[PDB]
Design a binder for this molecule. Structure first.
Ligand SMILES: [Mg+2]
Ligand SMILES: [Mg+2]
Ligand SMILES: [Mg+2]
Ligand SMILES: [Mg+2]
Lengths: 250, 250, 250, 250
């Protein structure tokens, strides 16, 4: 059927850092007014739903805590359905709390999983232990492949680099471009891919993931990707707009 | 809901080369008898549905031409929904016919796409032209990432290698582990991921793709992957059996 | 000691394709007049010394056949000192003749080496056989890593790509940036690295190789590399000039 | 001429960790008795010459501090000859002191170089700053490519991984397999490659570097590499022995 659910990326679409993109509030309110399930997605694992709601509210956009879905929440949802509840975690804040709520024990003693998110406390010891466990068979999971956040701030992908180099193994990244996180988002809305659209600014992450997941896609040009980037692209967005302000196919 | 549709990989699951895996016939007939939509999937683009039906029949397994779905068919289905109908193709047989049926013009003059499948006629000239077009912006699509077929026979992935090296660009692979081909298979059965299971022998292709697509997965040990390969695996199969002969959760 | 020998790269330094770089003739004649051993180096394996002398003469630059040293000659020199004289060769012309003169038997029956140069006859069969032999333990050698020649013409590196993909092994590239070819060039002049300078236009090949080999280096800006490319460079050229016309430290 | 100088790798050749390889003492004393210049090489940057002499003496092998040459010393020697004397260093101990003796100022303010060695204090902040500087044009140098030391202890290569991922740039590794460190070792002995042999246990580092540098090579089987590893090897050692105990071609 038609568009009945909406997954909308955050950075470069609804927010520029801590400043809302013009029209974001009206765009979101229009969707909620119509009663369409909505998920605001972000590949970063540092913020809780409340943190995000506060960030949005500070910027003048009001939405419920419940609409947010981060790679940390997605990782917890992924692990919930797994056997084994012991993990060595390289991360802090949101991810840690989510894992505890998923019934996990966080330990550096016989862990079943090595989970990497983001932490400014990352150090030689963590890289060492994570590499040791992964090399020894621990299930290697990471929240998102992004190498850095704002500026050149190390992000999950950068923290995994040393661990991968030493162990010779790569983690399963839960976030975009992996199609699984889109599946997780759909399950959160109890929605089907055929009636869901994803709005994003990055052709290589939002669009690629949505496409592979079977979703209709809308690329906005207010972020990373530019219009000429679609010319040579294997697949292309269902629609393209300068920003969410002109989206009216929903 | 429950399992209502089935995607079953071919090589290492139903066939060993030209010899059927014991129990394959009974397994498939049981599924069809129950009236469950069935798709027999293969990442290789060389055979037509009829070729595959004949191969199966020669091996003592009788199934309709219609159940087969190859990376060539999937590629044609992918391109059908695309704008532009001119392509420079590096391939032969099945793929070529499928593209013509999808309304394509195959040309080395201003092609919109560069499509790579498999062809034993692959040569310096083809690599040159493909690289030239891709470097110049043509949409780069490939049927499957496999580097070789039986023995060390070059396969699609190997043919793309030189083109990627020269152009500095990578193609969008339509086949496994890409989740999209699973989506295409579901659409072929008009089925939902939540009620579909995929049976395969390769953890890194059948299982990875099925998992990302939201399908229940069954790993058989009659092919590439072995049981101990799941220990360190980020995700694991819903079920594991020596072969299709013992599968009875369908 | 001082500069007593000279290795000078060809393309982008002395020639632009078939046209001489202004000042090339005078530059070379000045070196020969002083009696300094000279080697004109090129990473490409297609031309014989006579072909190169003819190309230079056609462009108005007169030099002896003996001064030229190609990756094909270097590869033959490399193999001369090796045990085993049976090789499966993916190449044509110059390289083939050089190997025969080095005492080799070219065969697809129990070859000791798999040697890849350049050949416009490259095809599926060659990739297959080369991959089969390398996968089975044959010593994998390639003339140069360049992915393409003029335009997007496949070069040695591109021909190796498919073979590497299938076999899972990489060849030993004889040409630049490998320091060995510089050693081979020095031996050709019976010269020491401490009294030899190399002139080149590519920071990542001529300069990198010369530097690692212990040679003084001169970068000309008449080719691939540009002046701003040295800012972030780990190592830098001993000298930099727009072209050979202003070189006077020799 | 003949062998007049000797470069001998340490780990897996003369030492197993803190235990000497049987015959090491006699091997080394024999070389020094003959008056042949000797350099004991190691790719690791953590120990000073005195530390190494003490380690050897504790193991029962007596040699002068002066014979040792580490990747830290080699890096300092490399930088001594460079313009610019400001560097942001990710490392500790030996490397730091060597840089100060080379006339460097270590700072995180407008550094000319970003130098990575080894430090158990490596953290998010260091990765961030190093990545920021490299991304902004700083000359990226690293002591050695090894990903880990003993066990799964992070080594230089692992520390560079995150920096490379964020900046998109790779460093120039001073240590093996880079031929430059062999050149540096020769200069330390004021020796020519044609009269120098290198003894090592790793085909991919000691042997590869020696070969590219024009040295005669001796592979011992007391460490990383095994005899069957030479079968498919592009190049092969001049000689091969179980350990230094049987080396008598010097
Ligand atoms: Mg975004
Ligand atoms: Mg299979
Ligand atoms: Mg050049
Ligand atoms: Mg060693």
């Amino acid at each position: 059927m038609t568009i009945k659910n909406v997954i909308c990326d955050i950075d470069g679409v609804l927010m520029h850092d801590n400043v809302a993109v013009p029209g974001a509030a009206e765009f979101l309110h229009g969707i909620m007014d119509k009663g369409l399930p909505l998920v605001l997605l972000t590949n970063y694992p540092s913020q809780t739903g409340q943190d995000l709601a506060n960030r949005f509210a500070t910027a003048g956009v009001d939405v419920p805590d419940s609409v947010f879905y981060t790679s940390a929440m997605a990782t917890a949802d992924f692990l919930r359905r797994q056997e084994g509840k012991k993990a060595y975690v390289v991360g802090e804040g949101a991810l840690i709390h989510e894992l505890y709520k998923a019934g996990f024990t966080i330990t550096d003693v016989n862990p079943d999983f090595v989970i990497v998110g983001e932490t400014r406390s990352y150090n030689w010891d963590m890289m060492h232990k994570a590499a040791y466990f992964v090399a020894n068979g621990a299930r290697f999971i990471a929240t998102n492949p992004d190498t850095h956040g704002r500026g050149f701030y190390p992000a999950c992908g950068a923290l995994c680099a040393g661990i991968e180099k030493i162990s010779g193994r790569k983690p399963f990244y839960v976030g975009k471009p992996s199609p699984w996180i889109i599946r997780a988002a759909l399950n959160k809305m109890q929605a089907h891919s055929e009636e869901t659209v994803i709005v994003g600014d990055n052709l290589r992450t939002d669009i690629l993931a949505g496409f592979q997941a079977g979703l209709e896609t809308i690329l906005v040009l207010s972020g990373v990707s530019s219009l000429d980037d679609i010319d040579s692209m294997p697949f292309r967005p269902s629609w393209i707009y300068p920003s969410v302000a002109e989206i009216d196919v929903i």
